[PDB]
Amino acid sequence: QTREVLDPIVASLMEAQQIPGMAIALVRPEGTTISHYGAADRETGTPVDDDTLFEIGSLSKTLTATLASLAEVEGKLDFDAPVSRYLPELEGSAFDDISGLNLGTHTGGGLPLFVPDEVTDRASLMAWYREWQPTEPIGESRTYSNLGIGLLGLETAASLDGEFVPTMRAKVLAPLGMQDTWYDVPEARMADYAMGEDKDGQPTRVSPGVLDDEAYGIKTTAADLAKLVRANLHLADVDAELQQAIDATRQGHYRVGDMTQALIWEQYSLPVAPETLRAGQGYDMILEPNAAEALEPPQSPRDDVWVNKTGSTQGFGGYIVMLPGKHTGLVMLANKNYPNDARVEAAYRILSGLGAI
Ligand SMILES: [Cl-]
Ligand SMILES: [Sr+2]
Ligand SMILES: [Sr+2]
Ligand SMILES: [Sr+2]
Numbered sequence: 123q124t125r126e127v128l129d130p131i132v133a134s135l136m137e138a139q140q141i142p143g144m145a146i147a148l149v150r151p152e153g154t155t156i157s158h159y160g161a162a163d164r165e166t167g168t169p170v171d172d173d174t175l176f177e178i179g180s181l182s183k184t185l186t187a188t189l190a191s192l193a194e195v196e197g198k199l200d201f202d203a204p205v206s207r208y209l210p211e212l213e214g215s216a217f218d219d220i221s222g223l224n225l226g227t228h229t230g231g232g233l234p235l236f237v238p239d240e241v242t243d244r245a246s247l248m249a250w251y252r253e254w255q256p257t258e259p260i261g262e263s264r265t266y267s268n269l270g271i272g273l274l275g276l277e278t279a280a281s282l283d284g285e286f287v288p289t290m291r292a293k294v295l296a297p298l299g300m301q302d303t304w305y306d307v308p309e310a311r312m313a314d315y316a317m318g319e320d321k322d323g324q325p326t327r328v329s330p331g332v333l334d335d336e337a338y339g340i341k342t343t344a345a346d347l348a349k350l351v352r353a354n355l356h357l358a359d360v361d362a363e364l365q366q367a368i369d370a371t372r373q374g375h376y377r378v379g380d381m382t383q384a385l386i387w388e389q390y391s392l393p394v395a396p397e398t399l400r401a402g403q404g405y406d407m408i409l410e411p412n413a414a415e416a417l418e419p420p421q422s423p424r425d426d427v428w429v430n431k432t433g434s435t436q437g438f439g440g441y442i443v444m445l446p447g448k449h450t451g452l453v454m455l456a457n458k459n460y461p462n463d464a465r466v467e468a469a470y471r472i473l474s475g476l477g478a479i
Contacts, residue, residue, distance in 0.1 A: 123146065124155055124252035127475040130477065132159055135468045139460040141439075142319055144169040144247050146475075147348035149451035151243040154348050162179040163317035164400065165325065173314045175307060176455040177328050178440045181433025184350065184371070187226055188279045188364065189294050192367035199281040201226075205273060208280045213229060213273040214226045215252045217273075225267075225274035226385045227375045231256030231413050232263060236334045247332055263380050264414040266407075268337040271386070274335030282392015297364055299347045303342040305335045316457040320426055324439040338435065344453045346443065351451035354444055355430075372429060372446070374421035376414040381407070382421075383414065389429040392447070392479070396470045403432050403462035425476075428479075430469075434459050441465040451477045 132144060136159060143160035158170040193199035204224065205217040212218075216231060224230040233254075241247045253271065258265065282293075287305045295303050309313050318326045330337070352358040353368050358369070370378065371385040374412040380398050382389045388402060401407060425447045433440035439459045444451040452469055473479045 124476065125411050128157060129473055131468055131471050131475070132157070135460075136160060136456075139458060139464055140165060140323070141456045141458040141460055143174070143316065143457050145170055145176060145453075145455045147344040147351070147453040148472075149348050149351045149357065149449075149453075149476075151449045153411075154345075155284060156348070157343050157403075160265075162314075164319060165232045165317065168313075170316070172343070172345065173302070175302070175304065175315045175343060176312065176440065176457060177318060177435045177438040178342055178347070178433045178455065179328070179338040179435035179438060179460065181347075181440050181442065183337050183386045184431055184442075185290060185294060185340065186271055186278070186336050187371050188289050188350070188368060189282075190222060190226055190274050192293055193278050193281045194361050195367045196282075197369065199278060205277050208277045211248050212251055216256050218253060222277055223324060223375065223385075224261055224276055225270045225277070227383045228266050228270055229261050229266045229376060229383075229416075230265075230267065230270045230273075231260040232258030232273055232411060233267045233273075235265070235409070237269060238270070241330065241332055250280060253410055255363045258354060258411050261416060262414055262464075264376065264383060264412045266393035268333060268358060271345050272333030272336040273327075275333070289434075290335075294364070297361055298353060299476075300342070300346040300349050303340060303346045305375075307341050316438075318435060319458045321459060322401045322435050323368050323427065326349045326389060326435075328437070329454075338433075343434045344455050345375070346455045347421055348451070351442060351444060351453060352478065355446060355449050355451055369423050372409070372423040374417050375422065377412045378407075378412050382417075382427075384429070387429050387431055391423070392426050394428050396466055399428070399430070399470070402430075402464050403466060432462055432465060439465060441469055443469045445473065445478050448478045450476070 142164040
């Protein structure tokens with residue numbers, strides 16, 4: 123079937139990259155197929171199964187985006203408004219000139235990638251935000267930023283008068299039925315938490331940190347992510363405002379060379395070459411400022427695109443692809459941080475082999 127296309131590609135991928143285990147969800151009209159491969163923990167050999175939790179790292183940003191979008195749909199958050207309107211503790215800073223939308227598209231004035239070590243809590247974070255000077259023109263340059271998506275999360279929480287994680291659970295996760303999705307893995311599910319493996323083959327598990335929940339802190343299953351994918355693909359039964367919020371996360375906001383930056387989601391018009399996709403996940407895109415052009419032939423969500431998002435921690439490597447025009451989606455989770463080049467190739471081969479491209 124489907125699995126005769128999928129299984130040898132993942133087998134070959136896990137051999138070539140020495141990945142201990144994977145969980146894969148394929149979302150199509152007709153339904154969702156979940157496949158589990160290998161070990162959740164290389165040392166114990168406990169197999170990956172329907173309960174195995176993977177760190178999705180930077181994929182967590184798509185949830186942050188979604189919640190921000192819902193606050194927008196509810197009229198509580200204005201995406202074009204200065205962030206300091208919702209966080210008055212930043213009045214008088216650069217955040218008088220930077221919007222939620224900038225934060226959700228990484229066009230916040232060159233806002234850097236990492237949280238600085240000197241920042242150890244919310245108060246030191248706010249004080250750092252207050253003192254920071256933009257280094258790139260706002261809304262005209264893209265720099266991938268944990269500080270930015272993190273600040274969007276803090277903006278959103280304030281706009282909704284709630285704490286980030288419980289608000290995310292109540293407003294996005296529970297309504298999508300994502301009941302295996304955690305910011306903090308419960309004691310009772312620790313036996314289900316996969317062990318990561320780093321590029322050197324060493325066991326590793328994500329550490330907590332400032333803005334962890336907002337930027338990289340989700341542990342979840344491939345099935346749960348498939349529900350977010352299903353809703354993005356209009357294959358779920360969802361509340362109308364939540365559907366709207368989800369759809370709005372795929373609105374194209376900036377052209378960035380060959381890539382279109384939507385709300386955290388990144389996309390390309392079809393047909394797209396794999397080398398273009400690989401470039402999207404490379405050093406030149408991820409670790410350098412890229413010219414970004416606001417789209418004012420303003421784009422509604424498109425039905426002729428490859429939509430993607432990578433997610434990593436030190437021990438884990440995830441990837442989501444969505445093809446709205448084919449109503450098809452792919453979630454690949456691994457407990458090894460393996461190269462993005464291989465993530466793209468494997469996803470392209472799977473989707474092509476299934477006839478979706
Ligand atoms: Cl960070
Ligand atoms: Sr506006
Ligand atoms: Sr936290
Ligand atoms: Sr190859």
